[PDB]
Amino acid sequence: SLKKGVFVDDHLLEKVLELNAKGEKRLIKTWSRRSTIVPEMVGHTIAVYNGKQHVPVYITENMVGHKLGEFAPTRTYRGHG
Amino acid sequence: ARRRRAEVRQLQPDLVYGDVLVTAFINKIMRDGKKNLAARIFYDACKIIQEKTGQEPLKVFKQAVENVKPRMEVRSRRVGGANYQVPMEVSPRRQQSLALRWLVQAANQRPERRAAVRIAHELMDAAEGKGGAVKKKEDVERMAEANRAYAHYRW
Amino acid sequence: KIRIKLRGFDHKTLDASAQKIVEAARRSGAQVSGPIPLPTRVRRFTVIRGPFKHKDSREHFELRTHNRLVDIINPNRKTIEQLMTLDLPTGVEIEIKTV
């Protein structure tokens, strides 16, 4: 963890701060899973990348301190049998 | 011991009672190379052989050892036919070693919580003859009893 | 009050250097107290012997820095000039200071 910190990539932090004061909001795809989320992210739909594709994740307020990659899982399982 | 008669390690005599057989016993209480613990345990035993018993604890030791010393045991020999159990008497050297060993091994089986009391009481009970370590001695001589049948195969 | 610090990877030449500076000083001037070996500082490398995988079977090497100290109390301008021009070192290193 960090504190003097709270790292977020400027790529989407741009387009998010932008989708606040535009008045309009829609579907935004980032490769940044290292970043942290919120507060102005909430209500937005971001497509994170698992290495394979961009997965839509709806953003709500208890998703807060979490990196984006937490909601975009990298592996595929479904068990053995 | 292919070539050699594999001669015996000579032990430096004790500091306090001044005896080889003590040290040889001390070493056998020694877990993981701690001698301090070994002797501080052993010596505390004689502290217990005193206020408890009136005799002179070294003398207990030399006796409880002599009581626990197996006179004959049964080892094995491969012959035309099966592998057997043949009675032979234990060498003087071996008597000692076996005795020292059982002494401790029985000792650490007794329930009394502290180390030095276990060796106290076992060395007492051994001396007086009713020791668990002595059970083993008898029980070994007893195996040499049963197989006195095959006693003609001895080397 | 001027002290010379000697280093090098070979003690056969190192000592053979510190020996020359002794009479590039002693005979050549004021008193200079004899060669004192400092402890040797040893870099060591222990490495796997073959290119692929045999993880036991390591060869190891070392690089040894040997140090030799010699002190000089009183300056003579023949000692100094000797210690400047008359240098005959090779793979040996040398230092000096006023302090």
């Binding site: 994740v57 709500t60 208890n62 998703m63 979490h66 990659g69 937490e70 909601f71 899982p73 053995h80 | - | -």
Partner: protein, 118 residues
């Protein structure tokens, strides 16, 4: 006598017998002992109902404990699951949450082994 929830410790020591409560131990014990100014080497068996009430009333009040604690750790986990997050899946599927390695022994969190053929 009994502190938060029921949780009766007894005999033994006092500062030890405090561990036996859910939410407390080692540190939190040796703490409330001098902040109610009670001897820790005393045995909960004997002591004034006075030092007993000072003791209960402090602990029960300072921090949350067995009932509400368990339910609070409970609720955190629930939140981690169902938010959809990755720490949440590993709670959902009963698997280890913090890095480590599931190709081999996860046993504590996987259960006993359930063997299969080759």
């Amino acid at each position: 006598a009994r502190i938060a929830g029921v949780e009766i410790p007894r005999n033994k020591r006092v500062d030890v017998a405090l561990t036996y409560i859910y939410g407390i131990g080692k540190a939190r014990a040796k703490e409330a002992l001098e902040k109610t100014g009670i001897n820790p080497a005393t045995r909960v068996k004997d002591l004034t109902e006075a030092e007993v009430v000072r003791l209960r009333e402090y602990v029960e009040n300072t921090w949350k404990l067995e009932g509400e604690l368990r339910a609070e750790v409970a609720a955190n986990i629930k939140r981690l699951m169902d938010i959809g997050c990755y720490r949440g899946l590993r709670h959902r599927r009963g698997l280890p949450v913090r890095g480590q390695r599931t190709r081999t022994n996860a046993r504590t969190r996987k259960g006993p082994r359930k063997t299969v053929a080759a």
